[PDB]
Amino acid sequence: FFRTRDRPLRPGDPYPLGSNWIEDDDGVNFSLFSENAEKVELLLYSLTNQKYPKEIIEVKNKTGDIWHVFVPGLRPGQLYAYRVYGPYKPELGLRFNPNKVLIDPYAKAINGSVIWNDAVFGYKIGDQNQDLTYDERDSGEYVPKSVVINPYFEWDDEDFIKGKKVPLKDTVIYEVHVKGFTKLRLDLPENIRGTYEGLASEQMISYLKDLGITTVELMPVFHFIDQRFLTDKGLTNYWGYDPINFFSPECRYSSTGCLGGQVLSFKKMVNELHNAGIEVIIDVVYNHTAEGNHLGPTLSFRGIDNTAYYMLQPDNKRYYLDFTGTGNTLNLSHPRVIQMVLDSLRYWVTEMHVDGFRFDLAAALARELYSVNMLNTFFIALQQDPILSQVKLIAEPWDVGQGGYQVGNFPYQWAEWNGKYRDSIRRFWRGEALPYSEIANRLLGSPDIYLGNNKTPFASINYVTSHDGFTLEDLVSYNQKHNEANGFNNQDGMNENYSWNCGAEGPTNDQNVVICREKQKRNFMITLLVSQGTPMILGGDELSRTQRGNNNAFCQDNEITWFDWNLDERKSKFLEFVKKMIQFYRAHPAFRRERYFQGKKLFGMPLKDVTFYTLEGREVDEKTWSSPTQLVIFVLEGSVMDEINMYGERIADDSFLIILNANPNNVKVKFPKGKWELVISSYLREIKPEERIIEGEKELEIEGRTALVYRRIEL
Amino acid sequence: FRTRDRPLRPGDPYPLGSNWIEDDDGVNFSLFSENAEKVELLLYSLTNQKYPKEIIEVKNKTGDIWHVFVPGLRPGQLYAYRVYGPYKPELGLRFNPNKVLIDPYAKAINGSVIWNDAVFGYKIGDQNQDLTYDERDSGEYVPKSVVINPYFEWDDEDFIKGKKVPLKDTVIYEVHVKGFTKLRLDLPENIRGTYEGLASEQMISYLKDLGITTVELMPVFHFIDQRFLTDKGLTNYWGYDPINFFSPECRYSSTGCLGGQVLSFKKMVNELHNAGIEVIIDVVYNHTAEGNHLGPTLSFRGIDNTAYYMLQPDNKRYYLDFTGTGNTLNLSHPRVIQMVLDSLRYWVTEMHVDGFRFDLAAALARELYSVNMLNTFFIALQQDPILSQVKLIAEPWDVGQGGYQVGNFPYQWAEWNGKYRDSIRRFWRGEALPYSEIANRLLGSPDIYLGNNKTPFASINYVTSHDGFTLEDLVSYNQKHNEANGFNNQDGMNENYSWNCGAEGPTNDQNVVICREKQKRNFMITLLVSQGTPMILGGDELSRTQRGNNNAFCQDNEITWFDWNLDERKSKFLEFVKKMIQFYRAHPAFRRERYFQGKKLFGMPLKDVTFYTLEGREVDEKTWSSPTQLVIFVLEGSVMDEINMYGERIADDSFLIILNANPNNVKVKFPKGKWELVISSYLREIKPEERIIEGEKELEIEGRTALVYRRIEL
Numbered sequence A: 001f002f003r004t005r006d007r008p009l010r011p012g013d014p015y016p017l018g019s020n021w022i023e024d025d026d027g028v029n030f031s032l033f034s035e036n037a038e039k040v041e042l043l044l045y046s047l048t049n050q051k052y053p054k055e056i057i058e059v060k061n062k063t064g065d066i067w068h069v070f071v072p073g074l075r076p077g078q079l080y081a082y083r084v085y086g087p088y089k090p091e092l093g094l095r096f097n098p099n100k101v102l103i104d105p106y107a108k109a110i111n112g113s114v115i116w117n118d119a120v121f122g123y124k125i126g127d128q129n130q131d132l133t134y135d136e137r138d139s140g141e142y143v144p145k146s147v148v149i150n151p152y153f154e155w156d157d158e159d160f161i162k163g164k165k166v167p168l169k170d171t172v173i174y175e176v177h178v179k180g181f182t183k184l185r186l187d188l189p190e191n192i193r194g195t196y197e198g199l200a201s202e203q204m205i206s207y208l209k210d211l212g213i214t215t216v217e218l219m220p221v222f223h224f225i226d227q228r229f230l231t232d233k234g235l236t237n238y239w240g241y242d243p244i245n246f247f248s249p250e251c252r253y254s255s256t257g258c259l260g261g262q263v264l265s266f267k268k269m270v271n272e273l274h275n276a277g278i279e280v281i282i283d284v285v286y287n288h289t290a291e292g293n294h295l296g297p298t299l300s301f302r303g304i305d306n307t308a309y310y311m312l313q314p315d316n317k318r319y320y321l322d323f324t325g326t327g328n329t330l331n332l333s334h335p336r337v338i339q340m341v342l343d344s345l346r347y348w349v350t351e352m353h354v355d356g357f358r359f360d361l362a363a364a365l366a367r368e369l370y371s372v373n374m375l376n377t378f379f380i381a382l383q384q385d386p387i388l389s390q391v392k393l394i395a396e397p398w399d400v401g402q403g404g405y406q407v408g409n410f411p412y413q414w415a416e417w418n419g420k421y422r423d424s425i426r427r428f429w430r431g432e433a434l435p436y437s438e439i440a441n442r443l444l445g446s447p448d449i450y451l452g453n454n455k456t457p458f459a460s461i462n463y464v465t466s467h468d469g470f471t472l473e474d475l476v477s478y479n480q481k482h483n484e485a486n487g488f489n490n491q492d493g494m495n496e497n498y499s500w501n502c503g504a505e506g507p508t509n510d511q512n513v514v515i516c517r518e519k520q521k522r523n524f525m526i527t528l529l530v531s532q533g534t535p536m537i538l539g540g541d542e543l544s545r546t547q548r549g550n551n552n553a554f555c556q557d558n559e560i561t562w563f564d565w566n567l568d569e570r571k572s573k574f575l576e577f578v579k580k581m582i583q584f585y586r587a588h589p590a591f592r593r594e595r596y597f598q599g600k601k602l603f604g605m606p607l608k609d610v611t612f613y614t615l616e617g618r619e620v621d622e623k624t625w626s627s628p629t630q631l632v633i634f635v636l637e638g639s640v641m642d643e644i645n646m647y648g649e650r651i652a653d654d655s656f657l658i659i660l661n662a663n664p665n666n667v668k669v670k671f672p673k674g675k676w677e678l679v680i681s682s683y684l685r686e687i688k689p690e691e692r693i694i695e696g697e698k699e700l701e702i703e704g705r706t707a708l709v710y711r712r713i714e715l
Numbered sequence B: 001f002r003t004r005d006r007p008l009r010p011g012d013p014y015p016l017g018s019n020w021i022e023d024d025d026g027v028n029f030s031l032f033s034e035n036a037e038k039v040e041l042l043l044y045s046l047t048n049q050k051y052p053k054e055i056i057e058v059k060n061k062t063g064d065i066w067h068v069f070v071p072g073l074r075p076g077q078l079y080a081y082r083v084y085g086p087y088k089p090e091l092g093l094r095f096n097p098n099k100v101l102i103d104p105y106a107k108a109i110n111g112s113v114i115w116n117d118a119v120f121g122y123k124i125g126d127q128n129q130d131l132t133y134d135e136r137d138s139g140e141y142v143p144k145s146v147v148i149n150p151y152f153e154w155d156d157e158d159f160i161k162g163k164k165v166p167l168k169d170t171v172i173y174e175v176h177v178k179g180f181t182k183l184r185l186d187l188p189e190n191i192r193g194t195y196e197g198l199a200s201e202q203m204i205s206y207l208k209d210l211g212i213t214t215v216e217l218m219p220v221f222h223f224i225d226q227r228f229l230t231d232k233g234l235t236n237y238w239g240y241d242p243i244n245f246f247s248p249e250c251r252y253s254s255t256g257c258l259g260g261q262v263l264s265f266k267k268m269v270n271e272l273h274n275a276g277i278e279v280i281i282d283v284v285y286n287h288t289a290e291g292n293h294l295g296p297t298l299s300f301r302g303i304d305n306t307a308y309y310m311l312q313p314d315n316k317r318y319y320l321d322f323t324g325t326g327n328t329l330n331l332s333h334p335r336v337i338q339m340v341l342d343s344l345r346y347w348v349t350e351m352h353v354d355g356f357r358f359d360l361a362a363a364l365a366r367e368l369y370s371v372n373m374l375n376t377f378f379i380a381l382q383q384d385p386i387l388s389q390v391k392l393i394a395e396p397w398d399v400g401q402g403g404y405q406v407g408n409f410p411y412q413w414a415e416w417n418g419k420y421r422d423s424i425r426r427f428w429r430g431e432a433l434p435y436s437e438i439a440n441r442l443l444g445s446p447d448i449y450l451g452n453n454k455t456p457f458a459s460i461n462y463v464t465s466h467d468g469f470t471l472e473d474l475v476s477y478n479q480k481h482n483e484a485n486g487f488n489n490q491d492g493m494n495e496n497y498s499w500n501c502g503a504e505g506p507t508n509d510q511n512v513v514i515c516r517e518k519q520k521r522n523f524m525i526t527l528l529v530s531q532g533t534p535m536i537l538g539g540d541e542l543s544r545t546q547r548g549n550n551n552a553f554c555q556d557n558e559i560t561w562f563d564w565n566l567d568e569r570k571s572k573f574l575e576f577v578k579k580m581i582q583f584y585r586a587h588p589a590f591r592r593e594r595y596f597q598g599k600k601l602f603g604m605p606l607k608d609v610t611f612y613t614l615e616g617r618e619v620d621e622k623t624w625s626s627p628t629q630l631v632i633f634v635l636e637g638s639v640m641d642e643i644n645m646y647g648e649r650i651a652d653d654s655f656l657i658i659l660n661a662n663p664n665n666v667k668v669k670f671p672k673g674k675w676e677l678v679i680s681s682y683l684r685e686i687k688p689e690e691r692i693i694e695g696e697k698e699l700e701i702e703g704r705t706a707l708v709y710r711r712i713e714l
């Protein structure tokens, strides 16, 4: 029989948001935003007992729209969660349910995941007035607890990489799933297989160093939840694109787990990577939550302050505007949400030492009420920020809502995923004949797309494959999508995959087939790694990774998506090809350009920095340039480039001659003046001894589906 | 030789301005320009600043930011820019590469404008005015930008960072670097009216004696003298008219200004901080010294005119004017917003300023046509890690339409309380206000800032500021005498709510002298006895007089000079202000973090705050609405809801305030207890039977008289 004031306490501070171990005053400082709540309760738990509060403190102080308290004696490791009281009126958007225990949206560590159970929903499930009703079952025992943490971490060798690192212009990106990376890597002891620690191991670090990639883009590592409808199918959220907190790294990747060790385990991994001269880019979901729409659960944001955080139907305020396609969309217009997102970004930069972000469904971040605005508050604040102005920003230039196709529209400093590039290039080798323009442009960093906005070929992130869609193997191994293992009666995944089976579906024995696939794989690989702009490799395509024609394996936490490291002749002999191709790209400036090629002679030279030929031997004209084709052929003049380094030197390369033939049949091209040693191709066969040079404007036959690069050694 | 037959590097876009890069032995020049077709970097020598020593074309670009890196250059270098572009004034395009321009990210400017028709980009004479294109080279008339070496050892300095003076206990001292120490024949000149002078041991000591916690400087942003002042023998004294947001005013610098003004400023701030004094700078972000059209072309107009300035949306050849100074910065542009925020962060982390008071803060919220207090600028500013910790005070309005924005300001934001200023002026002037009016002013004006969730200390109380009369003139003039400004006395507010006590100006009638000194102390007590943050107007303790000029914005002379020569009347008031500031800061009951509620607390009989009438009977209802010339209230120090950062409830003494603004005498009945006289505005010796009142007894109170009382027993 005591009071909330017979327990030693201090008023605390509104800032920072979240919970802060304040060594000096031997206690913790709890800050929580909510401008609509009427009352707030701090819930302290213990290691062993997590069904009930050890203790219940009432946050009684509130500076503006921020309740704050300081509890003495709390140190790092202490589990806590939030109750929020307030008005319940689903008609008006108010969805306060103080029975529902909530997660601190500023937690830097989160204990478990959700034990799915009707009681986490704050409306009555089986009730006819779903989500209009008020369920008052306590849900404490199911929702994971927030963990206070000790942010101290010694970034040994840290600080020096900080510093003339990988510019976007020589970068080569490697998209990886932390788990899938290394789950099936018995090369390491289990229990770091498919974790952070596993990712940044000697074995692996050496692999990446070998492979030749410079930066790694990890899939979502924001603590995320497994959708119930995936759970009720014996399934999981493998990709992670359903975040519930924006500051905590997913616990299911931590080797140390789960209690504070996820963030400790992460930092070491980045430390380890930087020591090896490797950047880190994290996939970032900011556009939606795991709380989905109405009918969805009440875990974190919905409880604390639903009016903010979430874009609501302005006429209803009971339902959720959804441009993300996942039930809700984050209200990037509310000052507090803009702050949270930005904090998160700075937090992950200065604290976790991330080097850049790939924003998922970017356009969703530039939404006001129904309209896109590449000049919204959030983006401008992000642009002026001293810390963030220095990190790499990359974008999925589109959301799913109406008018959400934002290719070419993102403020400077942004590189955007080029989906023009992927679609086109994929349809080119497929067999389709596109206008000589639509492909030459692609090949040259899509100047049309980006040059209209003062951007460079950097901004163009070129890729053939990706976690979204097929793999590179399954891109030449399928015509239709086989996502029946997802348990959605194969009613999910892109229908147009602009793919081709090489004359089958699925695995095969017909050598004539395999040969085709192995060719194409190398046509794709030659392209990407010879097109202007920034190339991205899909993690595993150097292993010929297969998802059995699953082009949407988002819930497939298993062998379907596991990296397979068991390499036979074929699989491995390609690995060697990707390695040598990458090295080629890297060793040659005429492909890592900060400026576009114009079509003229520069610096008073007698040659063009570039030149597009026809099939015999002939510069392209206004008409041939607009008319379709399946055979592109172009010369880059290393020496007559307008590329200057940071020291003001211009930058010769060698002169190349790229011959791309997507034509199914063979063709005969006439080589332009001068003499032209062979370097690289698609040919899996012994290179004919009469193909290894070309002289005197003479000519040569080329099997369909074949890429060739040539180096002029005399003119 | 072409622009390419001298060594260069492409340089870097971030950050903006010129930046000494030791390791690469050279300077990096960066400059925002959306619409420029061409940019040219001018390098002058110390000796010759008529023509450019060299011209370098900024060829390299990155989005909307031009930059080059020039090898060899060191800090100290003079430079300006030439921005080439289209000239279509009716469209808002006002580029004129004949006009040499100041770098808007200049951390140091060397000198000021040599006023001359050549600096206007349009033909001054011509009959179609601003639509015309003047082709005179303005170089020899325009101050050059300087590359500064930013280094500086802030001894100790980094430990006040740390805790500092919390708004709860603050006491604000508005000073004008110049006037403060101009007429200070203590120090050497070549140091009178300068940054260094302000920070001399003699002045620090003074400031500690007086007992103020933080100084608030008038604009120190490099500014120019408006030409319509130059052509009157006049200058811009206050300096509310800058062209650069990064470099401190040259004219306040003891060590010249080729970087001197920067160096000299830091060491002033450094010294203040070693005496535990906070530095707040009055800042102007809302408008530029480039006026409207017909104005000069110096910096922004010339670098990008469609970017920096709010243009009439139907014309874009005329400037939207919400400030009254010709033009208005549009903080809706991503780069404009970045510059203001960059600037703010620069003065914080670089000049170690402790906060800003924004002049015409409302005009900063204009975005489109109206005041959206939810604008991009304010939002970015709120979420900023650095600016998150500093103080943000505001002139909560502008001269615009619907600009009056009192109380609407974001949080952490404090406000100049204009209503206090006025209400209190009128109270002691005679007028009888609703007992509710004055009452609210005294409880920190909850009826205003309480609605927005703000605290009592977010209200910045003042009876005087640089706008209008001083305190000495406030009780000394009924009308204004701005004749000296040469504007037929059409400038300056007309309603000053002042009361000359019985003359106009300086007198001999002692009856009138004395009325003055009574009023001065009446105002003084009320201020330092109200809830909220009190701001003293520099020189008021010195009984400073502008000779009844209530707008000495251009009077850079004896009128505004701090007169340090004090007689007895002076020293007596000085002493009194001291004793009174010392009282404010002694008693937590006035430095409150929360508002008095009208009720008891903590299960105590007495209620934390009570108001009374002439007689004991507590202020009933219709008495709370009906006007009054007499205020009386009792703070119960021992029953306040006040908690320090340690979770301790605070307590104070219990005080009984008597504010008789009525001109005649009055009898008052003390409530029950046994009371002691602590301070009053009486200039005569206090009768011994006023020193201790007891037992519902009564007391004669002369008109215009304020009294504070402590209840020794109950």
Ligand SMILES: *[C@@H]1O[C@H](CO)[C@@H](O[C@H]2O[C@H](C)[C@@H](N[C@H]3CC(CO)[C@@H](O)[C@H](O)[C@H]3O)[C@H](O)[C@H]2O)[C@H](O)[C@H]1O
Pocket: A239, A241, A242, A285, A288, A324, A325, A326, A327, A360, A361, A468, A488, A491, A492, A493, A552, A554
């Ligand atoms: C970018 O962001 C997208 C949305 O967050 C990612 O979406 C992928 O993962 C989602 C969980 C999945 N959701 C839908 C699945 C289905 C049926 O297939 C429905 O039952 C659900 O209710 C939907 O929410 C997306 O379909 C899937 O593409 C994307 O991978 C990121 O790159």
Ligand SMILES: *[C@@H]1O[C@H](CO)[C@@H](O[C@H]2O[C@H](C)[C@@H](N[C@H]3CC(CO)[C@@H](O)[C@H](O)[C@H]3O)[C@H](O)[C@H]2O)[C@H](O)[C@H]1O
Pocket: B228, B238, B240, B241, B284, B287, B323, B324, B325, B326, B359, B360, B467, B487, B490, B491, B492, B551, B553
């Ligand atoms: C807040 O901001 C105000 C404007 O920046 C400051 O204004 C004071 O100084 C101005 C230069 C002065 N300008 C006008 C003067 C006159 C006639 O008196 C006209 O001829 C000019 O064209 C106007 O620009 C203001 O009148 C004066 O109050 C104010 O002090 C700051 O606190």
Ligand SMILES: OC[C@H]1O[C@H](O)[C@H](O)[C@@H](O)[C@@H]1O
Pocket: A398, A399, A400, A401, A405, A419
């Ligand atoms: O609406 C979602 C779609 O938007 C755009 O068309 C993208 O190019 C496509 O990949 C994506 O699936």
Ligand SMILES: OC[C@H]1O[C@H](O)[C@H](O)[C@@H](O)[C@@H]1O
Pocket: A405, A420
């Ligand atoms: O709406 C989506 C479409 O927008 C534009 O038409 C693009 O050119 C096209 O590639 C894309 O699929």
Ligand SMILES: OC[C@H]1O[C@H](O)[C@H](O)[C@@H](O)[C@@H]1O
Pocket: B397, B398, B399, B400, B418
């Ligand atoms: O428009 C500016 C004016 O607004 C209000 O009237 C203020 O009371 C006055 O002091 C200020 O000068």
Ligand SMILES: OC[C@H]1O[C@H](O)[C@H](O)[C@@H](O)[C@@H]1O
Pocket: B404
């Ligand atoms: O002129 C001064 C007056 O201007 C406006 O009417 C304001 O609303 C008022 O508060 C202010 O006193």
